[PDB]
């Protein structure tokens, strides 16, 4: 399961995802112990990995590369989508990753 999110929220929340043992491939712009903690394989945002993603998350942000990625993700026939509704994106994004 792969997810697409804006670059700023991934860069700002890198340490929590690293604690979640989720791989990160970012492009900059300047209960007993279980087998695994989260089901997500990769959270990133690029043109190359849109063909492998299965969902995407949209939020108000600023970056010159989110437009094409979001449009190509919306082009997909069979993909899930989530949107942010007010407040902080911190807890909402963390909860979505936890229950994905």
């Amino acid at each position: 399961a792969m997810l697409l999110a804006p670059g700023d929220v991934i860069k700002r929340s890198s340490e929590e995802l690293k604690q979640r043992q989720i791989q990160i491939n970012l492009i900059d712009w300047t209960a007993p112990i279980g087998a695994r903690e989260s089901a997500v394989m990769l959270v990133s945002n690029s043109i190359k990995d849109v063909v492998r993603a299965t969902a995407y998350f949209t939020a108000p942000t600023g970056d010159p590369h989110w437009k094409e990625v979001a449009r190509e993700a919306s082009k997909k026939k069979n993909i899930l989508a989530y949107t942010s509704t007010g407040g902080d994106v911190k807890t909402e994004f963390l909860h979505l990753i936890d229950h994905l």
Partner: protein
């Protein structure tokens, strides 16, 4: 790192190659790229057999004579087929059989065509055929005819109406055309097969494909399951999906090739994932007490050979019986005992021993059990009371507060006790699988693979027998820390076994897997130590590689991108094998039928000949490693039906005769002066031309001909009495025939004086060396038809000679290659029935629907 299909395939093939060369070197290369071979076999599967064409190729043509009432009609098929092949020579059997197979392949390939959207014309409210669709060419005779004969030919040409007919409740248009005999036979057989396939087996093939897709949890496209029932499409079935699996498992010495093909075609791609770091925190807490063996685990970056060992041990874990494991001898590196005992316990957990199947030898079990004995005896933080047994074998002592023993822990292949196969069930036969040879189900952990799993929640609250028993053993031994570590380990362990069970019971199901016979017989083969079938494959690993394998795991990221197109590849492979077998059988029968006129040849000769004219992809797939063994292979009547096999059989039946192959042994020598053209009295030459040929209307009188064979001719040549005997025969005004070995012939047409080599040609070559001289039978004999153009009459020396000239060679062919007819009979040969489909109909196959 990542592991995929082709990468692990070439890795395992490299290990197989290095092991086999190490084995072979005791008795006094690079791995081929599997991607290139696989692309070739996919492309060959995508190739078509037939050919769609608007109009059939021309079959007859006409040459006008000087007389206006006579035309000469010639079939172009013999003319264009006599030029196909090579020279026939008596002392090269391989060239002879190569020419024969090339000619029969050409005959088969020429006649395979399907009509589509033929041109038409409206006349008197009906449909009529435009002159180019029917195979008659008469361009030359139209300007030279009279008015009323032109009226006759126009009426006859316009009288070819078009009738309507049905083919499996589909509308078709049928008309009358002209074509040669074997080409029409091949076309009619193809049309008959097309009509016959529409009834029964195509629906069965579609249903079998749907069932196979249902088993493997993949859904096929709507086209391949729906366009069967469409009214406007005709579906021809070149390759039948329910392929018989005996043919692929019958070629000798192919277990490695089938295994590597299965790995290349069915393995998905995945990632290796480290366990939960809270377990690492537990290990760090354990590090306070240094008495633990894994406190000195040295969790550094593994080297390359350790990664290779992990990959090969997981490969051994995937295949239950194909791959066996052993230990690598390392007398150079010095090792601590802690790694030895942790490797021993890890190997006890992760592997299996026996019961129904096995993947280990007795040796590695022996070192494993002695290492576990060393762990339970040598190292200790404090002493624990223990009572030893009377017999001096490992694991024969009672240790702990209770009366718990370890005699049952001893490795035994009869019952498979101690390991994960202790009193569990592994093999199970439930429901007839889509493949009728691999109806088995296996379960390493003991949990079914039908139910889905979720990694974040699975693995809590359930245990199996062997793990619980050893945990009770270890807690009875007083080793609490290792017990807690393994309790942490357990969910990861069961998740990995669930994943491996799913991938082995769901994805690797193919024709290339072993059937139940040798799968069941493998264990007694290893127990008895005597090999009768194909031997198993053994590999080697290191001690710490076991710990690395236990720490790591394999989780698939996504499936192979070509899992859906494998059945077509296996079907076309089996069809090519069947074509090879039927070709071998037909060559043997052809050799046996006529031994007097054909030379005897070794099996290797025409075997190499038939291999030379075969596609390269099946050559590469087959040869991934005698003479009589493949003869025994050919003797088995196992077979796989296909369209190509039917066409090959029909072509062989047509080519059973030699007269239609333009190969004959009827050549004659007779002395007769060449007729001369009447140069004088120019008006007569203008109103009457010249015409000469070699062919006789009938064989000559039987009593006035003598017979020579190869042996007596060779003897006379050795004794130097050949030409004298020929002269003596010739002056008697008799005939002579060069019977015996088959001869190739050619046909040519000349509008002027032919070169002197053709006119003075001899049916033998005579040379001298300095046992007197050598003779060879004719390289080629030419059949010529001389029709001198009267336009050349104003320019002589192109139609006249200087002396009376004697021609010698005559050839008799029973079939009328060239005939003379008047204007009435030039359109009387239209007697063949042609069926066609409209261009508003679509022709589609299964391969085209899958976008190959």
């Amino acid at each position: 790192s990542s592991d995929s299909g082709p990468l692990l395939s070439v890795f395992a093939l490299q290990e197989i190659m290095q092991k086999v060369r190490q084995v072979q070197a005791d008795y006094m290369f690079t791995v081929p790229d599997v991607q290139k071979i696989l692309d070739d076999i996919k492309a060959l599967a995508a190739e078509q057999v037939y050919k769609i064409v608007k109009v059939p190729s021309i079959s007859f043509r006409h040459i006008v004579m000087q007389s206006r009432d006579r035309v000469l009609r010639v079939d172009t098929y013999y003319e264009e087929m006599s030029q196909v092949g090579d020279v026939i020579t008596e002392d090269e059997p391989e060239k002879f059989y190569s020419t024969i197979i090339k000619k029969v392949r050409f005959i088969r390939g020429k006649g395979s065509f399907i009509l589509h959207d033929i041109p038409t014309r409206d006349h008197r409210g009906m449909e009529v055929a435009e002159p180019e669709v029917l195979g008659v060419e008469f361009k030359n005779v139209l300007p030279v005819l009279t008015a009323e004969h032109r009226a006759m030919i126009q009426n006859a040409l316009d009288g070819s109406i078009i009738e309507n007919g049905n083919v499996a409740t589909r509308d078709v248009d049928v008309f009358i055309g002209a074509c040669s005999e074997p080409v029409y036979r091949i076309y009619n057989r193809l049309q008959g097969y097309i009509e016959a396939v529409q009834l029964q087996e195509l629906r069965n093939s579609i249903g079998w494909l749907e069932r196979l897709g249902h088993r493997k949890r993949i859904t096929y496209s709507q086209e391949v399951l729906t366009d069967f029932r469409r009214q406007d499409t005709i579906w021809v079935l070149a390759l039948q999906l329910p392929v018989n699996p005996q043919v692929v498992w019958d070629v000798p010495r192919s277990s490695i090739a089938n295994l590597i093909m299965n790995i290349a075609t069915c393995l998905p791609t995945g990632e290796y994932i480290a366990p939960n770091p809270r377990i690492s925190s537990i290990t760090l807490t354990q590090r306070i007490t240094t008495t633990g063996p894994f406190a000195i685990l040295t969790g550094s970056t593994p080297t390359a050979q350790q990664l290779n060992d992990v990959r090969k041990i997981y490969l051994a874990l995937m295949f239950p019986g194909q791959i066996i494991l052993d230990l690598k001898i390392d007398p150079g590196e010095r090792m601590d005992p802690a790694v030895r005992m942790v490797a021993g316990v890890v190997g006890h957990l992760l592997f299996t021993a026996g019961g129904r199947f096995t993947n280990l030898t007795q040796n590695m079990a022996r070192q494993l059990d002695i290492a576990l004995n060393d762990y339970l005896l040598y190292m200790y933080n404090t002493r624990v009371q223990v009572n030893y047994g009377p017999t001096g074998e490992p694991l024969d002592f009672q240790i702990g507060r209770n009366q718990y023993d370890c005699n049952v822990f001893r490795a035994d292949f009869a019952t498979g006790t101690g390991y994960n196969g202790w009193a569990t069930i592994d093999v199970e036969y439930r429901e007839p699988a889509p493949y009728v040879h691999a109806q088995r189900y296996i379960r390493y952990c003991g949990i079914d693979s039908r139910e889905l799993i979720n990694p974040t929640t699975y693995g809590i609250g359930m245990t199996y027998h062997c793990y619980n028993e050893m945990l009770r053993m270890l807690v009875a031994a007083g080793k609490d820390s290792e017990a807690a570590y393994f309790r942490s380990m357990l969910p990861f362990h069961m998740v990995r076994f669930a994943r491996i069970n799913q991938i082995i019971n769901e994805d690797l199901h193919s024709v290339f897997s072993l059937p139940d016979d040798m799968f069941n017989a493998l264990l007694p083969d290893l127990i008895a130590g005597a090999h009768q079938n194909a031997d198993p494959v053994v590999l080697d690993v290191s001690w710490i590689s076991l710990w690395f394998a236990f720490n790591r795991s394999f989780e698939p990221t996504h499936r192979n991108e070509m899992l859906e197109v494998a059945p077509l590849i296996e079907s076309v492979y089996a069809s090519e094998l069947s074509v090879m077998k039927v070709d071998m059988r037909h060559l043997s029968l052809m050799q046996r039928r006529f031994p007097d006129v054909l030379i005897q040849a070794r099996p290797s000769h025409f075997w190499k000949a038939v291999l030379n004219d075969s596609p390269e992809a099946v050559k590469a797939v087959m040869n991934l490693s005698n003479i009589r063994d493949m003869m025994r292979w050919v003797m088995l009547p196992s077979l796989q039906p296909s369209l190509k096999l039917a066409l090959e059989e029909e072509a062989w039946a047509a080519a059973n005769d030699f007269e239609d192959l333009m190969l004959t042994d009827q050549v004659y020598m007779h002395r007769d002066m060449l007729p001369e053209p009447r140069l004088d009295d120019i008006e007569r030459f203008r109103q009457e031309g010249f015409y000469y040929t070699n062919m006789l209307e009938a064989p000559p009188e039987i009593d006035r001909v003598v017979q020579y064979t190869y042996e007596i001719a060779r003897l006379q040549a050795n004794m130097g009495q050949f030409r004298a005997a020929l002269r003596r025969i010739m002056d008697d005004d008799d005939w002579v025939r060069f019977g015996g070995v088959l001869r190739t012939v050619r046909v040519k047409f000349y509008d002027a004086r032919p070169p002197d080599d053709v006119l003075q040609g001899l049916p033998f070559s005579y040379d001298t060396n300095e046992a007197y001289a050598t003779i060879k039978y004719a390289t080629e004999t030419t059949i010529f038809y001389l029709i001198y153009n009267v336009e050349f009459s104003n320019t002589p020396d192109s139609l006249v000679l200087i002396n009376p000239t004697y021609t010698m060679t005559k050839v008799f062919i029973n079939k009328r290659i060239v005939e003379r007819v008047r204007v009435g009979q030039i359109l009387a040969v239209l007697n063949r029935r042609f069926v066609a489909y409209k261009g508003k109909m679509r022709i589609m196959d299964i391969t085209q629907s899958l976008k190959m």
